Write a protein that binds this ligand. Structure first.
Ligand SMILES: [Zn+2]
Ligand SMILES: [Zn+2]
Ligand SMILES: [Zn+2]
Ligand SMILES: [Zn+2]
Ligand SMILES: [Zn+2]
Ligand SMILES: [Zn+2]
Ligand SMILES: [Zn+2]
Length: 171
DNA sequence: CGCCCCCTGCTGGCCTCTGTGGGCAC
DNA sequence: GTGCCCACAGAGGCCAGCAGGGGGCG
């Protein structure tokens, strides 16, 4: 198994150097200071990855369109979202919107489905909401009131006689 | 050990669509 | 009096940038 177990959490690794990193995450030690700005890193490669920002080095080139990127994960996501079909996307568990990247789903969850302690009143009635999505859905539902729907086309109407005359435009 | 990769997660400008209110016609 | 036309402010996913842990391997 993993003999080098951590004392402050439930982490364990088969290498003592890996436990040195994890224990360094608890203490917050940063034994690698950047010689340019005030940034300090816990790992060696993280500092070298930071030096790309000062030197402008972009060692990852999309083999399709030949754009360059600083980190490899950036290039992978680029290729996945720009040059690839049938990519699995994320569905929000609270609404129907589909979001491509996982981090953008988290931004959606915090902006649309977080509880707002200070309620906001609907701009059309006295209804008050503590969630942005419920508030927006309610205000958009005010447009549906006193509006006759559409069977085939996308035409909306407010008068029963005008919609009954619009139905005759199909026959 | 360090190097390179992976996934993660937040950031802020960008791209692109929405709806909405004022203006003119049976 | 209602039913379109169009500018325009807002909105939100899209996107590259940037560090955060963590494993395989020379
Ligand atoms: Zn720990
Ligand atoms: Zn620096
Ligand atoms: Zn590309
Ligand atoms: Zn949602
Ligand atoms: Zn919170
Ligand atoms: Zn309302
Ligand atoms: Zn119709």
């Amino acid at each position: 198994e993993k003999p080098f177990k951590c004392s402050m959490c439930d982490y364990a690794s088969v290498e003592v150097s890996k436990l040195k990193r994890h224990i360094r995450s608890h203490t917050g030690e940063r034994p690698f200071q950047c010689s340019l700005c005030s940034y300090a890193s816990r790992d060696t490669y993280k500092l070298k990855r930071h030096m790309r920002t000062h030197s402008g080095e972009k060692p990852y080139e999309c083999y399709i369109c030949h754009a360059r990127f600083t980190q490899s994960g950036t290039m992978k996501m680029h290729i996945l979202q720009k040059h690839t079909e049938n990519v699995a996307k994320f569905h929000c568990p609270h609404c129907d919107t589909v979001i491509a990247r996982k981090s953008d789903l988290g931004v959606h969850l915090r902006k649309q489905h977080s509880y707002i302690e200070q309620g906001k009143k609907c701009r059309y009635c006295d209804a008050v909401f503590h969630e942005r999505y419920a508030l927006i859905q309610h205000q958009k539902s005010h447009k549906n009131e006193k509006r006759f729907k559409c069977d085939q086309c996308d035409y909306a109407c407010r008068q029963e006689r005008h919609m009954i005359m619009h139905k005759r435009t199909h026959t």
